[PDB]
Ligand binder design. Structure first.
Ligand SMILES: [Mg+2]
Ligand SMILES: [Mg+2]
Ligand SMILES: [Mg+2]
Ligand SMILES: [Mg+2]
Ligand SMILES: [Mg+2]
Ligand SMILES: [Mg+2]
Ligand SMILES: [Mg+2]
Ligand SMILES: [Mg+2]
Ligand SMILES: [Mg+2]
Ligand SMILES: [Mg+2]
Ligand SMILES: [Mg+2]
Ligand SMILES: [Mg+2]
Ligand SMILES: [Mg+2]
Ligand SMILES: [Mg+2]
Ligand SMILES: [Mg+2]
Ligand SMILES: [Mg+2]
Ligand SMILES: [Mg+2]
Ligand SMILES: [Mg+2]
Ligand SMILES: [Mg+2]
Ligand SMILES: [Mg+2]
Ligand SMILES: [Mg+2]
Ligand SMILES: [Mg+2]
Ligand SMILES: [Mg+2]
Ligand SMILES: [Mg+2]
Ligand SMILES: [Mg+2]
Ligand SMILES: [Mg+2]
Ligand SMILES: [Mg+2]
Ligand SMILES: [Mg+2]
Ligand SMILES: [Mg+2]
Ligand SMILES: [Mg+2]
Ligand SMILES: [Mg+2]
Ligand SMILES: [Mg+2]
Ligand SMILES: [Mg+2]
Ligand SMILES: [Mg+2]
Ligand SMILES: [Mg+2]
Ligand SMILES: [Mg+2]
Ligand SMILES: [Mg+2]
Ligand SMILES: [Mg+2]
Ligand SMILES: [Mg+2]
Ligand SMILES: [Mg+2]
Ligand SMILES: [Mg+2]
Ligand SMILES: [Mg+2]
Ligand SMILES: [Mg+2]
Ligand SMILES: [Mg+2]
Ligand SMILES: [Mg+2]
Ligand SMILES: [Mg+2]
Ligand SMILES: [Mg+2]
Ligand SMILES: [Mg+2]
Ligand SMILES: [Mg+2]
Ligand SMILES: [Mg+2]
Ligand SMILES: [Mg+2]
Ligand SMILES: [Mg+2]
Ligand SMILES: [Mg+2]
Ligand SMILES: [Mg+2]
Ligand SMILES: [Mg+2]
Ligand SMILES: [Mg+2]
Ligand SMILES: [Mg+2]
Ligand SMILES: [Mg+2]
Ligand SMILES: [Mg+2]
Ligand SMILES: [Mg+2]
Ligand SMILES: [Mg+2]
Ligand SMILES: [Mg+2]
Ligand SMILES: [Mg+2]
Ligand SMILES: [Mg+2]
Ligand SMILES: [Mg+2]
Ligand SMILES: [Mg+2]
Ligand SMILES: [Mg+2]
Ligand SMILES: [Mg+2]
Ligand SMILES: [Mg+2]
Ligand SMILES: [Mg+2]
Ligand SMILES: [Mg+2]
Ligand SMILES: [Mg+2]
Ligand SMILES: [Mg+2]
Lengths: 386, 130, 132, 63
RNA sequence: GCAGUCAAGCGUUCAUAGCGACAUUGCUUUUUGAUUCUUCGAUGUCGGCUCUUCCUAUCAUACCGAAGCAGAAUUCGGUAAGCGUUGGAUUGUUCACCCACUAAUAGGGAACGUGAGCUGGGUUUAGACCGUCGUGAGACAGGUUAGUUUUACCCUACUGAUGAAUGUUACCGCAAUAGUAAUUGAACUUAGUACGAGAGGAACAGUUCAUUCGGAUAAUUGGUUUUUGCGGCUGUCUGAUCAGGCAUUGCCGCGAAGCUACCAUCCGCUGGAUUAUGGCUGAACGCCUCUAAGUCAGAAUCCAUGCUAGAACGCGGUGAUUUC
RNA sequence: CUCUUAAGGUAGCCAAAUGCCUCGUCAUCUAAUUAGUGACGCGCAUGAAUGGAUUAACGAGAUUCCCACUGUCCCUAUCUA
RNA sequence: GUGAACAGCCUCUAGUUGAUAGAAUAAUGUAGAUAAGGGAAGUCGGCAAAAUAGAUCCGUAACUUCGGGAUAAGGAUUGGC
RNA sequence: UUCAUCUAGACAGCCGGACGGUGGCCAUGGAAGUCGGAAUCCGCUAAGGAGUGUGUAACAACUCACCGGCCGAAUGAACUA
């Protein structure tokens, strides 16, 4: 029979299967369209998600009811120590799609990167790339043939960067290595730029700037095996039903005599590659700068990191991106940050933003004090001492 | 609602410069004049408040929206005046409409005014007391 | 509806009774519908402060009972979060009987009124005491 | 961006943090956290609650 | 139940704007009959609940064509099922009816979808009351009240989860194929303007919000508390004190972390080809004609862009590959 | 006055757990009532120990409403064994 | 012991410490809990749950077979010293 | 398939004319070819209905049959399957 009352379907089917991502680094699938009339530059950037905090700022949005009035907004903080180029990869157009033609690497590589190639680093004989490096022997005999090979061919050039994991508070030691597409100009200045950067780091003011709308590509917080009530948003069933409420009642009609792909089932929730778009950059922080949490209106030297330190993360000692709102993934997870794939002119974009103030109260509790200074200035002296 | 419904009266006291009263081509004392005014309604449904005001007055100030021209009710309130033997004078009003809405040009405007006056005198000659 | 109104948490679904804050003669207001609400299977429509509801008077002068009228919610009693970061709430829910144009069948509102509700409704502002 | 002070504890209230309550009398109350708010609604007396600003003043502590 | 054909007539005037008699040709299988082919060593009956998908004879939303289309509003039709189609009072109801919001509250199918999915209000056992019937036992497609809703561990399907083999191992990627997504409204302003005698009274562009849906996220606010974390309280037991036990987590206040809420916050891309329809050039047919050749535009459509998985028998690049 | 059968439904009661028509009609209660209550009564097919009408108290009986209450619901989340 | 009490809760005498174990802490369950604002809108129906609860003092309606209805309703108070 | 027109100039297109008794008779509040009935004659003609439409309150004003100018070879109507 027909339905009885119409209601929208539960859950979006262009986000299927709801399985676990192949890896915890979400694949950055599309890069932006290359404009070759602009300097060789990176298009994405790796990151580590630290935590969130709160800001206030004036609002320039004429005709709103909060024009020139302060607003307060959540923000996520990505710890972005500069990343070090160690490779160049070049892809050719072919009638079956882009083909990687060759890879060429830097002459030496941090052991924190070479860790990426082992599952038992400690007990290895760490011989990875020992004999590749010898092609640099006299003048780079072999390697300069490859670089020419990329220049001759190669509709697209990608650079292999890797995170300086050791510069963060994680227990990891094993860096994250990723391709980043050079949107430079001329497939040649693109690959010169790569050679001119082997083992040379790239900071992130090079890549992004204040107010730049950017996308976040990461792997959703995993949650294990979920019932359909919470996993799909299904209606919890009436208190009286025998055999369970967190269920779908009619797994399907008699015909098609098959449970169909479109019906909510119990299974894995979270741990899904998500590409989430249009998060405005609110501040690009310098580690080689004091007073990261400072602002032209607050002006009381303090770092970004909050009292007690970011919960489950640690302290911010490096460059960081502070982006408006929230992003897929949890604290400590690798986070690719893409430049926007289109030129947004919404004017919600395009809006210059200036932080009045950046909360740095503790997140481990009902944090009352911005700085250990102002605690004391408020509390007084105490018995243990001072 | 922004529509006059009852026609209501007000008496205005106003002066005139010494050279202005010299032109007055009828016997005329002093320099201060007393204007007994009535603000009338346009709607046909209220025409009874026009004849009620035209019985108590001597001249009539007739207003014509410049862009709308002389309209059907302009025509019939005039037949109300000339029946009662009342002298008219005209204000072609609302011109800022012509510069903004119509982007009019000086000749475009003058000739607007001419045919409008031509239109009123047609009404005036047909019904004005021979 | 003289203005645009930013979203605020809903706290008065249908069936809710709120005090009638005006000297109209009504002691309360029983919400049966909320103007501007949309549709979802099984979802009770609900009002926040400033919203125009359709109500009846369960306690009050007979001349106002047995009859559906529009009301405007002026306090809300359910924590809501302004764009300046504050979660606030009143001690009670309350509204005033109005007419669709937004005018007020009352004559003077008693008790505080919320900022959002009074920006929306001038005729309501004209009779409000302490706002926000 | 005036910070405000907790009505019950005199604690400092940074933007976004805590709650604000409009009593019937139009008297505004600010609470920096949930605990301060809970106590006040239990009708507790801050002068008798040991950690509040206005209990150290009534006991001339730390001044 | 729905749709054509002829056109007397309605439409002041005028057959076909919108309608349409007398006739007559059809379609549909959510109606009810007619049959009795399957099932009586048994295919779980009504309705709701839940949830998915499909149909179009389209209620709304996109773009259009017609009008007895001035505006506003409405009607008729076209492409069109992309997307939505609701909250309640009485009833077991399907149906009905009314209140009320709404852009709209369209009709249907899937064993009159869906009972090892629920419920069990109705129907339809045995208990019992009434009314009419009956000599009686009893009967009623009359009323009424009580009345056990069983199994999955197997196969397949669906959801998620591993995995042999390919010389070994590790890293970075490609993209076949499959999936795909956003929705709709209001206020300001345009404007008391176009139009209109008046009464009334728009639209495109711009601004601010909002609804339904989606994916995440936890700074905040809120909820949860075995942090049995700190405090408080009763009873009893440890001779008192200190400090504890027991009271199935003894109870109360607060309670961080975690989990989480339109109860919380953030985010949801833009190129092309088309439909209908409007056109250009232009014959057929010395004219005309959007069409016959050729061609411009153009829709909530489709294809891509983007997003999701990645063929476990599709692929590339790359590293290191066992002294004894 | 009369016919069929002997009599011809009185006192009461009612769309009642008894009314087909029927969601009866009127009043009331609700924004809205096929529900409830009060009325009406040519009552398909009420009615006097096949007992009629009424009744305080009692009732794990059927039914309607109100106050309090609340995860029944909006609309779900969370903790324990 | 508490307490009106052979209630419940803790203890002395006496008896028992027996129910296959270990490690994990997904979904769905069964059993036990809590919940912002709203408060039956959920449902055939308030089913289930919640609210109430002892005792002292106060106050207590229609109706009634005068016996009741009654803990009606409804207020106040409660430790320690 | 049947019937028509055409080098004595058709069909099409364009272009000129489309008159005079006459506002023809009965009506009509008005009706001058053009709401409607009845009449359907004549004159002057290359031809022009007592009117094919549009129009008016009624005339006016355009329009068409009909005639002609132009061009120069074929073309028109009604049926069948
Ligand atoms: Mg439907
Ligand atoms: Mg059950
Ligand atoms: Mg925290
Ligand atoms: Mg105008
Ligand atoms: Mg429902
Ligand atoms: Mg909390
Ligand atoms: Mg049908
Ligand atoms: Mg016609
Ligand atoms: Mg028709
Ligand atoms: Mg059969
Ligand atoms: Mg048979
Ligand atoms: Mg079966
Ligand atoms: Mg169609
Ligand atoms: Mg149209
Ligand atoms: Mg017409
Ligand atoms: Mg669909
Ligand atoms: Mg319902
Ligand atoms: Mg069927
Ligand atoms: Mg069935
Ligand atoms: Mg089944
Ligand atoms: Mg069953
Ligand atoms: Mg039953
Ligand atoms: Mg029975
Ligand atoms: Mg009987
Ligand atoms: Mg008998
Ligand atoms: Mg019967
Ligand atoms: Mg029966
Ligand atoms: Mg499987
Ligand atoms: Mg595809
Ligand atoms: Mg007006
Ligand atoms: Mg617009
Ligand atoms: Mg969610
Ligand atoms: Mg918490
Ligand atoms: Mg103890
Ligand atoms: Mg214990
Ligand atoms: Mg093409
Ligand atoms: Mg996308
Ligand atoms: Mg594979
Ligand atoms: Mg007899
Ligand atoms: Mg009787
Ligand atoms: Mg009866
Ligand atoms: Mg009766
Ligand atoms: Mg019968
Ligand atoms: Mg009811
Ligand atoms: Mg009754
Ligand atoms: Mg009888
Ligand atoms: Mg009898
Ligand atoms: Mg007897
Ligand atoms: Mg008796
Ligand atoms: Mg008695
Ligand atoms: Mg004792
Ligand atoms: Mg005992
Ligand atoms: Mg005892
Ligand atoms: Mg024994
Ligand atoms: Mg459980
Ligand atoms: Mg349970
Ligand atoms: Mg609650
Ligand atoms: Mg509460
Ligand atoms: Mg309540
Ligand atoms: Mg109900
Ligand atoms: Mg029942
Ligand atoms: Mg119960
Ligand atoms: Mg009592
Ligand atoms: Mg005492
Ligand atoms: Mg010939
Ligand atoms: Mg000819
Ligand atoms: Mg010819
Ligand atoms: Mg005539
Ligand atoms: Mg005529
Ligand atoms: Mg004759
Ligand atoms: Mg003639
Ligand atoms: Mg003529
Ligand atoms: Mg001819």
């Amino acid at each position: 029979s027909h339905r009885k009352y119409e209601a929208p379907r539960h859950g979006h089917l262009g986000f299927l299967p709801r399985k676990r991502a192949a890896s915890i680094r979400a694949r950055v699938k599309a890069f932006p369209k290359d404009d070759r009339s602009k300097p060789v530059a990176l298009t994405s950037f790796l990151g580590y998600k630290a935590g969130m905090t709160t800001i206030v700022r004036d609002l320039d949005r004429p005709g709103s009811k909060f024009h020139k009035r302060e607003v307060v907004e959540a923000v996520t903080v990505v710890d972005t120590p500069p990343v070090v180029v160690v490779g160049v990869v070049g892809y050719v157009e072919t009638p079956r799609g882009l083909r990687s033609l060759t890879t060429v690497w830097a002459e030496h590589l941090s052991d924190e990167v070479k860790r990426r190639f082992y599952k038992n680093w400690y007990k290895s004989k760490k011989k990875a790339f020992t004999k590749y490096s010898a092609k640099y022997a006299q003048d780079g005999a072999g390697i300069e043939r490859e670089l020419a090979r990329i220049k001759k061919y190669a509709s697209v050039v990608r650079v292999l960067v890797h995170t300086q994991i050791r510069k963060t508070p994680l227990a990891q030691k094993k860096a994250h290595l990723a391709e980043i597409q050079l949107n430079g100009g001329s497939i040649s200045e693109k690959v010169d730029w790569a050679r001119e950067h082997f083992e040379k780091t790239v900071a992130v003011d090079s890549v992004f700037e204040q107010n730049e709308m950017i996308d976040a590509i990461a792997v959703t917080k995993g949650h294990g095996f979920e019932g359909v009530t919470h996993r799909w948003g299904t209606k919890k069933l009436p208190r009286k039903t025998h055999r369970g409420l967190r269920k779908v009642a009619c797994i399907g009609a008699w015909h098609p005599a098959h449970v169909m792909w479109s019906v909510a089932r119990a299974g894995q929730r979270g741990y899904h590659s998500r590409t989430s778009i249009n998060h405005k950059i609110y501040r690009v922080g310098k580690g080689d700068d004091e007073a990261n949490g400072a602002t032209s209106f607050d002006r009381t030297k303090k770092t970004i990191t909050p009292m007690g330190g970011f919960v489950h993360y640690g302290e911010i000692k490096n460059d960081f991106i502070m982006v408006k709102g929230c992003i897929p993934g949890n604290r400590k997870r690798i986070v690719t940050l893409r430049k926007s794939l289109y030129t947004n002119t919404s004017r919600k974009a395009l809006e210059e933003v200036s932080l009045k103030w950046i909360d740095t109260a503790s997140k481990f509790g009902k944090g009352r004090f911005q700085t250990p200074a102002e605690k004391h200035a408020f509390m007084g002296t105490l018995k243990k001492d001072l | 609602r922004g529509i006059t419904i009852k026609s209501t009266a007000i008496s205005l006291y106003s002066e005139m410069s010494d050279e202005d009263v010299k032109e007055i081509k009828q016997k005329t004392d002093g320099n201060s004049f007393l204007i007994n005014l009535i603000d009338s309604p346009g709607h046909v449904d209220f025409s009874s408040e026009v004849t009620a005001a035209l019985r108590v007055t001597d001249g009539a100030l007739v207003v014509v929206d410049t862009i709308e021209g002389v309209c059907v009710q302009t025509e019939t309130v005039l037949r109300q005046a000339l029946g009662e033997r009342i002298k008219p004078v005209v204000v072609i009003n609302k011109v800022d409409r012509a510069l903004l809405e119509l982007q009019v040009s000086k000749e475009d405007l003058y000739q607007t005014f001419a045919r409008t006056v031509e239109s009123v005198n047609v009404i005036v000659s047909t019904y004005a007391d021979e | 509806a003289q203005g645009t109104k930013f979203r605020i948490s809903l706290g008065l679904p249908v069936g809710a009774i709120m005090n009638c804050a005006d000297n109209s003669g009504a002691r309360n207001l029983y919400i049966i519908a909320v103007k501007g609400s949309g549709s979802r299977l099984n979802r009770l429509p609900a009002a926040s402060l400033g919203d125009m509801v359709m109500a009846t008077v369960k306690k009050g002068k007979p001349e106002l009972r047995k009859k559906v009228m529009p009301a405007i919610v002026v306090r809300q009693a359910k924590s809501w979060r302004r764009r300046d970061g504050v979660f606030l709430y009143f001690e009670d829910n309350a509204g005033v009987i109005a007419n669709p144009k937004g005018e007020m069948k009352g004559s003077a509102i008693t008790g505080p009124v919320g900022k959002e509700c009074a920006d929306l409704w001038p005729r309501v502002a004209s009779n409000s005491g302490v706002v926000v | 961006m005036k910070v405000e002070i907790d009505s019950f504890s005199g604690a400092k209230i940074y933007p976004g943090r805590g709650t604000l309550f409009v009593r019937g009398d139009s008297k505004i109350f600010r609470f920096q956290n949930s605990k301060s708010a809970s106590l006040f609604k239990q009708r507790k007396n801050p002068r008798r609650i040991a950690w509040t600003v206005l209990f150290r003043k009534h006991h001339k502590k730390g001044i």
